[PDB]
Amino acid sequence: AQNPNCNIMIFHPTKEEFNDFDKYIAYMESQGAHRAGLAKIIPPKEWKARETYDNISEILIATPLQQVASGRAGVFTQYHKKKKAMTVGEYRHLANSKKYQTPPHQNFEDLERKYWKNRIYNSPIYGADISGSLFDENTKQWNLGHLGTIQDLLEKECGVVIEGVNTPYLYFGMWKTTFAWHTEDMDLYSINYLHLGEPKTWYVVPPEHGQRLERLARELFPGSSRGCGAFLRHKVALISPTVLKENGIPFNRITQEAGEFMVTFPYGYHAGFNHGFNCAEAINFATPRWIDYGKMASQCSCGEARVTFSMDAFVRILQPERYDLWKRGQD
Ligand SMILES: O=C(O)CNC(=O)C(=O)O
Ligand SMILES: [Mg+2]
Ligand code: NI
Ligand SMILES: [Zn+2]
């Protein structure tokens, strides 16, 4: 079995190997990359996502989210407070202000220590889930706006034609902006490209150990657990690496820098934080190996997680028994 310790693998494809996305994901899995739940892909030196970032300040963040923490340093929840719209130029100026900027630090490890010691005492503002793409339409390789769709994958594998579309989203981050512990909708893969700026630290639990994370989360957030059998779908729970170690949860960590891709694998729980002002683009995707994860994926039926038009059809075809009760939570 490849990668039995479930380490995060880092790949360095050639420009020739960067031409066929599906075949390279399949290659990564042949090397055991999926066992970690997360892999890093450094693009070939000749590749570029676009020519420059000079003209991005007029993108609008229509609903910036202030992330307000509650709890103890190692175990907290966050809620998202809606703020007034601002442009990317405005947001970058805010990220760089004395109140919100990245503090002095020695290295990524010192900064991680400061995050966990200090995250809960601050409320950073995140521009999340903005529909759109920063890939140049003439970038042919690994262009997240030109991938094959999950709906076409389901048609090719299962023969059924469904409604829905699959498009990318932009994330503008600042120091301490946080992604809570989650797997993707319907336990899909995700791919994430850090277009510019400061890094993003990721934590991940191997898919084969996801249930151990879930069990700890039920113990750590007991009221949440009673309210919904899949409350991690709400994307509000943070658990520090120290707390995971104290409870014997297997995980790994890695820092993504500008110009690198991360891929999350089906049922790979992940969480993390941004080091400073940055802009990432991400999209979900499927492969043939995903189908069985999609069939088994948990769902939020308390109604909090409230998900896309396209996810309907996935639940409808792959989880027909759930379909009824799940759409009661989504309507
Ligand atoms: O970039 C972020 O804030 C979070 N991204 C992901 O969870 C992802 O790409 O799967
Ligand atoms: Mg602009
Ligand atoms: Ni994710
Ligand atoms: Zn729920």
Domain locations in the chain as residue ranges: 1-331
Sequence-separated (6 or more) residues with CB below 8 Å from residue 129: 169, 171
Given resolution (angstroms): 1.8
Taking the CA of residue 173 as reference, the ligand 1 atom at the shortest distance is: 3
Ligand 1 binding pocket, CB closer than 6 Å = 171, 179, 184, 190, 192, 264, 270, 280, 282
CA dihedral 37, 42, 43, 46 (to 10 degrees): 180
The number of the ligand 1 atom at minimal distance from the alpha carbon of 274 is 3
Helix (H, G, I), strand (E, B) or coil at 72: strand
Q: Are 273 and 185 in contact (CB under 8 A)?
A: no
Annotated binding site for 2-oxoglutarate: 126, 192, 200, 235
Which ligand approaches the C-alpha of residue 232 most closely? 4
How far does the centroid of ligand 1 lie from the alpha carbon of residue 159, in Å?
30
Amino acid identity, position 2: Q
Q: Which two tokens stand for residue 311?
A: 């996810």
**Centre of ligand 2 from the C-alpha of residue 256, in Å:** 25
Ligand 1 closest atom vs CA 262: 9
Q: Which residue has the tokens 């039926």?
A: 301
Element (H, E) at 81: strand 75-82
Which superfamily does CATH assign the domain made up of 1-331 to? Cupin (2.60.120.650)
CA distance 47 to 27: 20
